Amino acid sequence: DQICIGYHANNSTEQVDTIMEKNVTVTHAQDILEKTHNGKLCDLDGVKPLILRDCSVAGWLLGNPMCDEFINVPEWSYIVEKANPVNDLCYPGDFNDYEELKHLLSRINHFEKIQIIPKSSWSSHEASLGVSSACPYQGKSSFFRNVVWLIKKNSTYPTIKRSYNNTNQEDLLVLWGIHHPNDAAEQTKLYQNPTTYISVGTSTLNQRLVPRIATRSKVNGQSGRMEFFWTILKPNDAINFESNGNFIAPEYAYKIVKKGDSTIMKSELEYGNCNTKCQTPMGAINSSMPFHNIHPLTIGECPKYVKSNRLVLATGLRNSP
Amino acid sequence: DQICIGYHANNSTEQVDTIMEKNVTVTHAQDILEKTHNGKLCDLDGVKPLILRDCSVAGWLLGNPMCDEFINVPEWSYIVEKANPVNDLCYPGDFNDYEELKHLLSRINHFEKIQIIPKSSWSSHEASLGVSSACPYQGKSSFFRNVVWLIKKNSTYPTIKRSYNNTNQEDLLVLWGIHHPNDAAEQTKLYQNPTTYISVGTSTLNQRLVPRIATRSKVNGQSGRMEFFWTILKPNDAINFESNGNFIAPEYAYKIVKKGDSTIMKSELEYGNCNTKCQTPMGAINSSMPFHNIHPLTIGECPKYVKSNRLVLATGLRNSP
Amino acid sequence: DQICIGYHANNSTEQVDTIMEKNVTVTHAQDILEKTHNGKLCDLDGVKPLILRDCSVAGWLLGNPMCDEFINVPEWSYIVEKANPVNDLCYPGDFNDYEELKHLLSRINHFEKIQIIPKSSWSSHEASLGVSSACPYQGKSSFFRNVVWLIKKNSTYPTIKRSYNNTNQEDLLVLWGIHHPNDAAEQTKLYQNPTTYISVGTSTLNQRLVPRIATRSKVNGQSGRMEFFWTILKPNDAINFESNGNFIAPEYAYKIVKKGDSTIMKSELEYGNCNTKCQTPMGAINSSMPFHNIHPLTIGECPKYVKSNRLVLATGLRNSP
Amino acid sequence: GLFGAIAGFIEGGWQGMVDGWYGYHHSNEQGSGYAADKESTQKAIDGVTNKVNSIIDKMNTQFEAVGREFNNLERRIENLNKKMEDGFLDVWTYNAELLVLMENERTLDFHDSNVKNLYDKVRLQLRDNAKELGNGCFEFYHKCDNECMESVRNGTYDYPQY
Amino acid sequence: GLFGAIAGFIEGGWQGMVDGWYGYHHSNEQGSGYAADKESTQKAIDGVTNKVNSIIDKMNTQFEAVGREFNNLERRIENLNKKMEDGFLDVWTYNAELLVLMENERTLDFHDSNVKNLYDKVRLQLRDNAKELGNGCFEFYHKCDNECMESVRNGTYDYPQY
Amino acid sequence: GLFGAIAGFIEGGWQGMVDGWYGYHHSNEQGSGYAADKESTQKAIDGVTNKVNSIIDKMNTQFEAVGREFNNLERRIENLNKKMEDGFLDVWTYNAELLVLMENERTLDFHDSNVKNLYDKVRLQLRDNAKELGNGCFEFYHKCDNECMESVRNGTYDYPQY
Ligand SMILES: CC(=O)N[C@@H]1[C@@H](O)[C@H](O[C@@H]2O[C@H](CO)[C@H](O)[C@H](O[C@]3(C(=O)O)C[C@H](O)[C@@H](NC(C)=O)[C@H]([C@H](O)[C@H](O)CO)O3)[C@H]2O)[C@@H](CO)O[C@H]1O
Ligand SMILES: CC(=O)N[C@@H]1[C@@H](O)[C@H](O[C@@H]2O[C@H](CO)[C@H](O)[C@H](O[C@]3(C(=O)O)C[C@H](O)[C@@H](NC(C)=O)[C@H]([C@H](O)[C@H](O)CO)O3)[C@H]2O)[C@@H](CO)O[C@H]1O
Ligand SMILES: CC(=O)N[C@@H]1[C@@H](O)[C@H](O[C@@H]2O[C@H](CO)[C@H](O)[C@H](O[C@]3(C(=O)O)C[C@H](O)[C@@H](NC(C)=O)[C@H]([C@H](O)[C@H](O)CO)O3)[C@H]2O)[C@@H](CO)O[C@H]1O
C-alpha cells in the first residue's frame, strides 16, 4: 500500500517563454495580446467618422467645388484623410498655419457653417467673376465656395471696409485669403490699383498682408497663388477687414458647436458600414485583451499598443510528454 | 524535552503588496513615498523667491506702472507667476518671442537695472506726453516705465539716430517697441510723417520694423497696439536705433549679473514666510524619503516625483494573526 | 566509505553585484559593456567621412574661399564639423533655415556640383567686382565662390530676369542671397536704384526679399550683411529670379545624387587614418559587446549606449575563499 | 525547476487527475485513485489570478501616441516627435515582454514549490511509519485502507496509532 | 511561501521572541524560553538593508520635468512637450511600483528561506537523535538540559555523545 | 543563498573538480576522487546561456539619439530635445542595471538550487542505507567500492542489495 504526491498533466500544446528556456509546454496559459482587426473603418460608439475620401481638410474647409459632399457635414467621432488627397488646394497656393489648424480639429467634433458676409452685399465690387480654370465644377470654371474672390467693377476697386461681430455664443473659425498675381499688368487688370493691402484686425489679430509678385511655374494650369489665413474669433469680438485689392473675402465661416475628443486618422481605407468601440487606421478592434499590436494611433477605449508578436502568460504548470 | 525553530511576530498592522497577494501584514516595513507638503511658497535655501503676485514677467520687465513693487528687485531663487495675472500688457499688444525670453529667465537669478538712454536726452522730440488711459498710475494716465513713448515736437518728428555701447562686463537685456496706430490720421497726428520705420542693429541683430495699420477691437479702452521686442546685447557690442516715428525707446535696460538655476513656477499661492530645501507650486517639502507625489515641477534638492498613492517596502516578515 | 555532493570552485576574482549583496566573487562571469575606443575619427565601412576641419556646413556650401579643399567633395559616410569652426560666414550675415538644411544633410551622402547660371552670362551687369575684404583669398579680396555678387554697370542696374529649369533626374539644392547695405548712399552707390527687391519663384516657392537698412557693428571688418536662402528644386521644375538690385545670384548649385544614412557629428578631432564599423565623436568602436558607454551619438552597427560604468553578468556560481 | 519536485524527483504529471493541479494518488487492496488537494490548488489559483490582474493593471497606464503634423520646413521637430513616440513604444514593449518572461518563470517555479511543500507536508506526517520511495510515493509499513488514506489527505494521519 | 516554513509547517510566529527575526524555543525540566539566532538574523538585516538602498539608488537618476511655455500657435509642440513629460512620469511610476511589488515578494520569500535553512541546519545536527514532530520542533530521545540546548544553538551538538 | 546548499550546509566549493559545476567526491579503500555530474551541469550551462542571450536580445531594440540643431531663438525646443534624449538614456540605463542586478541574483540562487536538487536526488536513493553527515556527505553502512560509487552517480544504486 502506498500514497503518492503528484501534479496535473493534460493534452495541451500551449507554450510560454521564460528567461532560461523558450517554448516550454504548459497545461494552461493566457494570451493577452490582440493580434486581429476587422480591416475596416467603422462608426465609433455608433457615431460615424467624417470621411473626407479624396478631399483634404483644406479642400473641405475652404469649400473646394469638388468637395461638395462635405458642405454642412454632421457631427463626427473622428476624421479620416488620405496620405495624398487629390482634391486639395485646386487653385495653387499655401494654407497658413495649416498644421496648427489641423491640430485644433483634434479637439473638435462638429462645425455649424454660417454666412457672415453675403455675396450679394458686395455692391461696389464684382463678386461673381472670381473664378479659375484650376478649380472646375461641372465643366465650368468655379472657385472655393466659402470665400469670394472680389474683382474691380467699371475699372475701379474702392477700398473695402467690412466688419463682422460674433454675436453667437461660440468661437468662430473665420477663413480668408490674399491673391498673388503673376505680373504688374495682371495686378492692374484684376484690381486696377498697383499697390494693395489687406488689413485684418480682431482683439488679438493685427494683420496686414501685401501681394508678393513673382514668376512661378504653373500648377494646375495657373502661375498665380492664393495664400489662405485663419483665426478664431471669440464670442462678442469683431473682425475688421480693409483692402484696396487682392482680397479673398469670407462668405461663410464655421461655428464650433461641439468640442471634445477626436483625431485626424490617416488611412487609404473607405467606410466599412460597421461599428466599434476602438478604431485604428487599419481596421477596428474588439477584444478583452489588455494589449494589441495592430497600430499605435488609435481612438476610443482600446488595449495598449505593443510591438510584440507574442505575449502569453503561463497560468498552469509545466506539462508532461 | 524539545527544541523548536520559529520566527518573529509582533502587533504590527502594516501591509505591503506583492504580485500574487495584496494587503499582506508584515512585522516591519518602510514607507518611501512622501505624501505631505506644508502648503506654502517658501524661501529656497534661505533665498526668497521673486513673487510677481498680480504682475507678469511682461508687466515687470516693461515696467507696468502698477508693477512698481518690482523695480530693482533683489536676487531670487525662483520666480512665481499666476496663471492669469491681471497686470500684464496694460496697453494692448504683443510681446515678441515672449516664451523664448521667459525660458531665458530660468537661467537667471538677478537683474541689475541701468539707464542706457536718459529721458532728458530727447531734446528734439516730446518725451513726456507719451502716455495712455489704459496704463493708469495714481488716477493719472501713465505708461510702461522702462520705455519712452516718443511723439512729435512743434509738428515735426526728425529722424532719431541713437547708439548705446555695452561697456559693462555683462550681457544686457535691452527692450523696445513699435506703436501701431488706428488710422492714417492718427499716424500723422502723433508722428507727423506718414511712412515710418525703426531700424535696430547690433553685431547680430538686423531689424527694421514698420507699423501695421488696422481697425481693431478696443482692449483696455484702446484700439492701438504696442509690439515689444528684445535682444541680448553682448559686452563691448553696441546697439543702433534709427526711426522717423512710432518708436518706443529704451530708457532702462536690465544687466544680467547672476546666471544659474532658477524656474518660473506657476501658482496662485502667496508667500508663506517660511524656508525650505525643496519647493513645489503647491507647497514645500521636507523629508528623507526617496520619492514624493506632490507635484512634478519642483526646484531644489528633492525626492523623485511619482504618480503613486502608496509605496511601501517590506523589510520584516509575514506577521501572524 | 562515503560519497559527497559538492560544487566547483576556482581562483577567479571576478565580482558581480546583486540586489542584496555587492561585490560577490564568482567562478565565472561575463562583461557585456564596452568601455574602450581607439580615440580616432575613422572611415566607416571603408568609406571616408567628410571632414570639414576648420570650415562649416555654411562655409562649404556657399563656397567660402578658404574652404577650397571642399569643392567637389566625394561621397561621404558621415560629416564632421567642429563646435566653433573659424571659416564660417566670412562676410557677416545669416543663413536662413540653416538647421533645417543641416537636418536635410543627415539624409545625404553625396552632392555633385553643377553650374546653373554662368558668371560670363551677366552681360548687362558687372559680375567680377563683387568681393569684400572680409572673405580674403591669397591676400586678395575674394567672395563666396558659388554665388555671384552682382553690381551696377555704367551706373545702371537693369532688372534681372533669369530662369533655370531642372532637367536633371535629381533634386537640386539651389542657394542665393540678398545684400543689406549700411546706408542709402551705399545702396545707390552699389546698385543705383534706391528701392529694390528679389522675387524668387518655383512651383512651391513664392519669395520676395527686400533689403533691410540699419547701422550695424562691424563684423569681420564690415557692417553690411548677407542673408542667404535656399530651396530644393524638384526635377522638371524651374526656378525664376527677378531683381533690380542687392541680388546675390547662384553660379553653382548642388545635385543630390546619393540619399541615405548619414550624420553631422560634432568633434574637435581630426582624421585617424583608420577604419571602423561603428563611429563615435570620441573615437571608433570594435567589439562584440551588446552595450557600450563611450558616447550616445554614434553612426554604424553599434552596441547600445548606456551611462553605466560597469555591467557584469554572473554565469558561474559563488566562488569560495 | 528550482524546487526539484516537478519533472524532478516526481518525474511526470498525471493525466488522470482532472479535479485539480496538485493532489494524491493512492493504491491499496481495495483499489486505487486520484484525489486533488483543494487547499493547495485554490491557493495556486488565487496566486496566479492576482498575478495576471496585477500585470494587466500595472500596464494600464502606458504611453499613447497622437497624430501631429508638420510642414516641409519643420523636419527637425517632425523627427523629434517620431523619435519620442517610437522611444516610448520601445520602452513599453520591453516592459511587457520582460514582465511576461520574468513572471512566467516565477509561475512555473511557484507550482513546483507548491508540489514540494505538499510533499513535505505529507512526509512530515508519516515520519518513520512509511518508506520514502524517492519518486513522490510513500509505501506504508501497515495496511492503509481508504479511511487511512483519507486521514493522510486530511492532515489527520494518526502516527501513534500505527 | 515558496520555502514552506513561514505560515507553513511552522504555523505561526512568536510574539515572545523580540531579540531577533529567527531563533529557537526550548523546553525542558528546568524551564523554557526564546533565543534569537544572531547569525541568520544579521544576515537578513544586511540583505534587506542593501536591498532598500539598492532600490533607492537605482531610482536616484530619473526624469525631471521643467516648465516650458508655448504661445497660442504652438499647440503641436505644447502638446508634444506635455506627452513627453507625462510619458516619462508614467514610465518611472511603473518602474517604481513594479520594483516594490517584485522585491516585496522576494523579501517575504527570503525570510521564509532563512527560517527553513535554519531549521534544516538544526535537523542535520540532531539526525536520528531526536523526533521530527512536523511543526518546527524536535523532541529529544535523551534529556537535554540548558547546556545541551545551548550546544544545538551553538552548532556544537555532540551527536556521538547522545 | 535561498536553497541553503552553496556556502550553506555544503560549506565550500572544490578546487579539485574542474570537469563541471556540480558533482560527487568519493572516498573508499581503493582511493578517492572528483566526478562531475554532466546532466545537472549541462542543464545549468543551457539555463545561463539562454539567460545571457535573452538579456542581450531584449535590450536589442532600445533608444538611439540623433544630432539635431537649433538656433539661438529655439531654446525651448533645444531644451525639450535634450530632455527627451537624456530621459530615454536614463530609462534604458536603469533597465540595464536592474536587469543585471536582478538576474545575477537569480543566477546564483539557480546554481544553489541545482546543488541542492542533486543532493536530494542522491539522498533519496541511499535512504536509510547511509548516514547523512550534515555537510553534503553520506557515510555508507556497507563497503562501497568504485562500482558501488558509480551506481550512486548512475542513479542505479541498488538499495535492496545493500
Ligand atoms: C502663351 C500664351 O500666350 N498664353 C495665353 C494664356 O495665358 C491665356 O490664358 C489665360 O492666361 C491667364 C494668365 O496668363 C490666366 O491663366 C487665365 O486663366 C484664368 C483662370 O482660369 O484662372 C482665367 C480666369 O477667368 C481668371 N480669373 C480671374 C478672376 O481673373 C484667372 C485669373 O485672372 C488669374 O488666374 C490670376 O492669376 O485666370 C487664362 O485663361 C490664353 C487666353 O487668354 O491665351 C494664351 O495665348
Ligand atoms: C466715438 C468717439 O467719438 N469717441 C471719441 C474718443 O475716441 C475720444 O477719446 C480718445 O480717442 C483716441 C483715439 O480715438 C484715443 O483712444 C484717446 O486715448 C488716448 C490714450 O489714453 O491712450 C489719449 C492719450 O493721450 C493718447 N496718447 C498719445 C501719446 O497719443 C493716446 C494715443 O494717441 C492713442 O492711444 C494711440 O493709439 O490715446 C482717447 O482719449 C474722445 C476724446 O477725444 O472723444 C470721443 O468722442
Ligand atoms: C571712418 C572712415 O572714414 N572709414 C572709411 C572706410 O569705411 C573706408 O573703407 C571702406 O568702407 C566701406 C564702407 O564704409 C566698405 O567697408 C569697404 O570695404 C568693402 C569690402 O571689402 O567689403 C570694399 C569692397 O570693394 C566693397 N565691395 C563691393 C562689391 O561693394 C565692399 C562693399 O561695398 C560693402 O561691404 C557693402 O556693404 O566694401 C571699405 O574699403 C576707407 C576706404 O574707402 O576709408 C575710411 O576712412
Ligand SMILES: *[C@@H]1O[C@H](CO)[C@@H](O[C@@H]2O[C@H](CO)[C@@H](O)[C@H](O)[C@H]2NC(C)=O)[C@H](O)[C@H]1NC(C)=O
Ligand atoms: C520556438 O518555437 C517557435 C515557433 O513555433 C520557433 O519559431 C520558428 O523558428 C524557426 C527557425 O528557428 C523558423 O523556421 C520558423 O519560421 C519560426 N516561426 C516562428 C518564430 O513563429 C522557434 O524556432 C522556437 N525557438 C527556439 C529557441 O527553439
Ligand SMILES: *[C@@H]1O[C@H](CO)[C@@H](O[C@@H]2O[C@H](CO)[C@@H](O)[C@H](O)[C@H]2NC(C)=O)[C@H](O)[C@H]1NC(C)=O
Ligand atoms: C459686438 O456686439 C455686441 C452686442 O451687439 C457688443 O456688446 C455690447 O456692446 C455694447 C456697445 O457699447 C455695450 O453697451 C454692451 O454692454 C455689450 N453687450 C453685450 C450683450 O455684448 C460688443 O461689444 C460688440 N463688440 C465689439 C468689439 O465692438
Ligand SMILES: *[C@@H]1O[C@H](CO)[C@@H](O[C@@H]2O[C@H](CO)[C@@H](O)[C@H](O)[C@H]2NC(C)=O)[C@H](O)[C@H]1NC(C)=O
Ligand atoms: C486592500 O486594502 C485597501 C486599503 O485599506 C483597500 O482599499 C479600499 O478598497 C475598498 C473597496 O475595494 C474601498 O471601500 C476603500 O475606499 C478603499 N481604500 C483605499 C484603496 O485606500 C482594498 O480594497 C484592499 N484590496 C484588496 C485587493 O483586498
Ligand SMILES: *[C@@H]1O[C@H](CO)[C@@H](O[C@@H]2O[C@H](CO)[C@@H](O)[C@H](O)[C@H]2NC(C)=O)[C@H](O)[C@H]1NC(C)=O
Ligand atoms: C564700444 O566701446 C568699446 C570701448 O569704449 C570699444 O572697444 C574699443 O574700441 C576701440 C575703438 O577702435 C579699440 O581701439 C579698442 O581696441 C577697444 N577697446 C576695448 C577695451 O574694448 C568697442 O569696440 C565699441 N564697440 C563698437 C561695436 O564699436
Ligand SMILES: *[C@@H]1O[C@H](CO)[C@@H](O[C@@H]2O[C@H](CO)[C@@H](O)[C@H](O)[C@H]2NC(C)=O)[C@H](O)[C@H]1NC(C)=O
Ligand atoms: C565594491 O568594490 C568596488 C570596486 O573595487 C569598491 O569601489 C571603491 O570604493 C571605495 C570607497 O567605497 C573607493 O575608495 C574606490 O575609489 C572605489 N572604486 C570603485 C567604485 O571603482 C566599493 O567600495 C565596493 N562596494 C561595497 C559596497 O563594498
Ligand SMILES: *[C@@H]1O[C@H](CO)[C@@H](O[C@@H]2O[C@H](CO)[C@@H](O)[C@H](O)[C@H]2NC(C)=O)[C@H](O)[C@H]1NC(C)=O
Ligand atoms: C522644364 O523643361 C522640361 C523639358 O525641357 C519641361 O517638360 C516638358 O515641357 C514641355 C513644354 O510644354 C511639354 O510639352 C512636355 O510634355 C514636357 N516634357 C518633359 C520631358 O518634361 C518642363 O515642363 C519645364 N518646366 C517648366 C516648369 O516649365
Ligand SMILES: *[C@H]1O[C@H](CO)[C@@H](O[C@@H]2O[C@H](CO)[C@@H](O)[C@H](O)[C@H]2NC(C)=O)[C@H](O)[C@H]1NC(C)=O
Ligand atoms: C478525515 O477522515 C477521517 C478518516 O477517514 C475521519 O474520521 C472519520 O470520520 C467519519 C465521518 O465523520 C466518522 O464516521 C468516523 O467515525 C471517523 N473515522 C476515523 C478513523 O477517524 C475524519 O473525520 C476526517 N477529518 C477531517 C478533518 O475531515
Ligand SMILES: *[C@H]1O[C@H](CO)[C@@H](O[C@@H]2O[C@H](CO)[C@@H](O)[C@H](O)[C@H]2NC(C)=O)[C@H](O)[C@H]1NC(C)=O
Ligand atoms: C556552546 O555551549 C557549549 C555547551 O553549552 C559550550 O561548552 C561549555 O562551555 C563552557 C564555557 O566555556 C565551559 O565552561 C564548559 O566546560 C563547556 N561544556 C560543554 C558541555 O561543552 C561551548 O563552549 C559553546 N561553544 C561555542 C562554539 O560557543
Ligand SMILES: *[C@H]1O[C@H](CO)[C@@H](O[C@@H]2O[C@H](CO)[C@@H](O)[C@H](O)[C@H]2NC(C)=O)[C@H](O)[C@H]1NC(C)=O
Ligand atoms: C553504471 O554503473 C554500474 C555499476 O558500476 C553498471 O553496472 C555494470 O556495468 C558494466 C558495464 O556494462 C558491466 O560490465 C557490469 O557487469 C555491471 N555491474 C554492475 C554491478 O551493475 C551499469 O551498467 C551503469 N548503469 C548506467 C545506467 O550507466
